[PDB]
Amino acid sequence: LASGHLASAFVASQEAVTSSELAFFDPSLLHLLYFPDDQKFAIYIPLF
Amino acid sequence: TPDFSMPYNVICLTCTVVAVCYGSFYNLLTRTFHIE
């Protein structure tokens, strides 16, 4: 866009949008529900 | 079906059973006999 090539700029921007949306909205980001931090002592105290 | 209300208690109890063996074997292997 600084240089002046509008077609290449448009293609690059489209690829940027596609990649950013795929990265942000990946289902793999949400993997497990929250485990309470005030209940981990019940997980680590009894054995360790 | 399992209990569905016993994930913490089961973890505690099974870990305690394992720690029983761990502690007993640790004492027997580490400490040595002494008089009085």
Partner: peptide, 27 residues
């Protein structure tokens, strides 16, 4: 109304820890 799943810290962790530590290690 209902009950969420919460650990019984006083009831079981204390019991199953004082069944190990004073029985074997500390004394």
């Amino acid at each position: 109304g209902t009950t969420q799943l919460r650990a019984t810290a006083t009831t079981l962790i204390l019991c199953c820890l004082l069944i190990i530590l004073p029985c074997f290690i500390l004394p």
